[PDB]
Amino acid sequence: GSSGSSGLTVTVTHSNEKHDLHVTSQQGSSEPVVQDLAQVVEEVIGVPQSFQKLIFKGKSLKEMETPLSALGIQDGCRVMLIGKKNSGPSSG
């Protein structure tokens, strides 16, 4: 058979748990970058880039324009995310 894809399958741990997410390109860039990774989270997990903190290999990923490949991330990896998820009765 034949198998292949563009995006990448990387898990993102936030709430002392693991959340598998599928990263994809920005319908324009040959390959997806950290930027997308951050979005996939706020879009999947539910945490804003202002509350979530990316961390890989003990390094806090703070670069979006940077390719996930450069940081060392690639289809089949586990990224650590530090932040607060929408939990608890909030009124305002």
Swiss-Prot record:
List each copy of the Ubiquitin-like domain by range.
8-86
- Coiled-coil spans in chain: none
* Record protein name field: BAG family molecular chaperone regulator 1
What functional role does this protein have? Answer: Co-chaperone for HSP70 and HSC70 chaperone proteins. Acts as a nucleotide-exchange factor (NEF) promoting the release of ADP from the HSP70 and HSC70 proteins thereby triggering client/substrate protein release. Nucleotide release is mediated via its binding to the nucleotide-binding domain (NBD) of HSPA8/HSC70 where as the substrate release is mediated via its binding to the substrate-binding domain (SBD) of HSPA8/HSC70. Inhibits the pro-apoptotic function of PPP1R15A, and has anti-apoptotic activity. Markedly increases the anti-cell death function of BCL2 induced by various stimuli.
Q: Could you tell me which residues belong to the region Interaction with HSPA8?
A: 36-83
Supply the source organism for this entry.
Answer: Homo sapiens
Q: Which part of the entire protein is covered?
A: 144 to 222 of 345
Describe its assembly.
Answer: Homodimer. Forms a heteromeric complex with HSP70/HSC70. Binds to the ATPase domain of HSP/HSC70 chaperones. Isoform 1, isoform 3 and isoform 4 but not isoform 2 interact with HSPA8/HSC70. Interacts with NR3C1. Interacts with the N-terminal region of MAPRE2. Interacts with PPP1R15A. Interacts with BCL2 in an ATP-dependent manner. Isoform 2 does not interact with BCL2. Interacts with SIAH1. Interacts with HSPA8 (via NBD). Interacts with HSPA1A (via NBD) and HSPA1B (via NBD). Interacts with SIAH2.
* Inducing stimuli: Up-regulated during differentiation of bladder epithelial cells and down-regulated during differentiation of prostate epithelium.
**Expression sites (tissue/organ):** Isoform 4 is the most abundantly expressed isoform. It is ubiquitously expressed throughout most tissues, except the liver, colon, breast and uterine myometrium. Isoform 1 is expressed in the ovary and testis. Isoform 4 is expressed in several types of tumor cell lines, and at consistently high levels in leukemia and lymphoma cell lines. Isoform 1 is expressed in the prostate, breast and leukemia cell lines. Isoform 3 is the least abundant isoform in tumor cell lines (at protein level).
PTM: Ubiquitinated; mediated by SIAH1 or SIAH2 and leading to its subsequent proteasomal degradation.
